[PDB]
Each structure stands twice: as C-alpha cells, then as structure tokens.
C-alpha cells in the first residue's frame with residue numbers, strides 16, 4: 524500500500540494566528556467570532572494537509588469532501604489538545620499564540636463546560652506522554668473516523684487507507700506494546716462524545732448567529748450548512764475501535 528510517518532511529521536501545517544483583538548471587550552460574541560475565524564483559517568490548512576496525505580488522493584473527490592466535513596471538529600479539537608500539551612503542558616487551552624485560554628476566557632466564551640471537556644483530553648496527552656509520531660497518525664485516524672451511515676462512494680478504497688494507518692499506529696507503539704495501542708485507541712474513541720457536544724453548541728449558535736452576534740467565515744458556513752442536516756438526521760456514522 525505504501526516511511527509514511529516521516530511524511531506526516533513533515534506535512535504538519537504551520538502556526539495559525541487567531542487575529543484576537545484584545546482592545547475589544549471579551550464578550551461571548553467577540554470570543555466566539557474570533558474562535559470561528561481561527562477555525563476557518565485552520566480548515567484551509569486541513570485541506571492543504573489532506574491533499575498531500577499519503578493515500579488521500581486515491582479517494583474520489585466526493586469522499587474527500589465527506590471526510591473533511593464530517594471530521595473538521597475532531598481534527599480541530601485534537602490539534603488544540605496537542606498545542607495545549609506541547610506549549611503549556613496542558614495547563615491552558617492554546618488556541619493560537621495570540622489566543623491562550625485561562626479560566627477567565629473559558630467563562631467569557633459561554634463554553635466553560637465544553638472547554639473543561641477539551642482540557643481533559645489535553646490532560647490525557649500528559650498522562651500518556653503522547654509523542655509527536657503517535658499524534659500525527661492519530662490525526663489521520665480522526666480524519667477517517669466518521670462516514671455516511673450508508674458508507675462512502677468508494678468504501679473499499681477508504682477501508683484500505685484506514686486499515687493501513689491503524690497498522691502504522693500498531694508498528695509505532697512498539698517491552699510490551701499492546702497496552703499502549705489500546706490506551707491510544709481508547710483515547711481516539713473518546714473523541715466522538717466530546718465532538719458531539721462541541722457540534723451541538725456550534726449548530727445552536729449557527730442556527731441563530733446574528734441573534735447571538737456570532738460571526739462565521741465563508742468556509743465554516745459551507746461546511747456547517749452541509750454537515751448540520753446530516754448529523755441531526757443520523758446520517759453520520761462514527762467509527763469506533765471498541766463499541767461502547
């Protein structure tokens with residue numbers, strides 16, 4: 524099918540600034556609009572990364588779009604946990620160098636509980652001493668973790684790619700290694716529940732954005748308008764390593 528982990532380490536997207544205006548009041552609307560703007564900028568980086576991801580090009584365009592749209596909150600939250608771990612030892616939420624959340628910002632954002640939920644994942648990175656090589660493979664697995672309930676256009680092509688990256692994770696964890704592999708698959712599975720709550724809040728603010736004064740960039744409007752009716756109608760199928 525394929526040293527893909529070496530390629531993953533090298534294609535990691537660069538630093539994305541939030542463009543946070545600290546001279547503006549820290550209302551929920553101002554913080555959430557900055558977070559949405561940062562998400563749009565990161566989503567362009569996700570598309571550029573995916574294009575050069577080994578095996579991703581073999582999937583038809585429709586499937587590439589489906590995977591990117593279904594997984595955007597997963598990839599985004601996992602990278603946030605990584606940045607938080609690497610740059611603050613998971614003491615804060617490192618959204619961007621110019622936007623680091625402390626307790627004050629967690630409360631002001633009107634997402635305190637969702638923020639604490641995120642902080643728990645970054646705290647697991649500390650507990651496990653997650654490595655950069657493990658992180659990069661796991662991020663690919665999150666891109667491939669949610670599919671249509673009736674499957675993709677080229678389901679066989681997708682399963683081959685996913686299976687091959689799971690094999691890369693197993694080779695990477697290796698004096699006993701099975702223990703580590705299951706610790707990593709348990710972490711990946713726990714992302715689906717967190718992502719459900721994050722999407723619930725995102726969908727809510729999207730449905731009445733002006734009413735709440737929350738701004739969405741064009742990129743997020745497009746993704747969310749497509750994703751929201753699919754997720755809410757049960758057309759999304761989260762893939763679990765270990766059925767709950």
Ligand SMILES: COC(=O)[C@@H]1CC2=CC(=O)CC[C@]2(C)[C@@]23O[C@@H]2C[C@@]2(C)[C@@H](CC[C@@]24CCC(=O)O4)[C@H]13
Nearest residue numbers: 555558559562599600603618637638721724725728
């Ligand atoms: C703790 O929340 C988050 O951090 C997640 C993950 C994430 C990490 C990043 O590093 C980029 C930003 C995103 C995508 C995100 O902050 C934006 C704003 C999102 C889309 C939010 C879930 C709900 C919200 C709030 C307001 C809205 O409309 O939806 C995301």
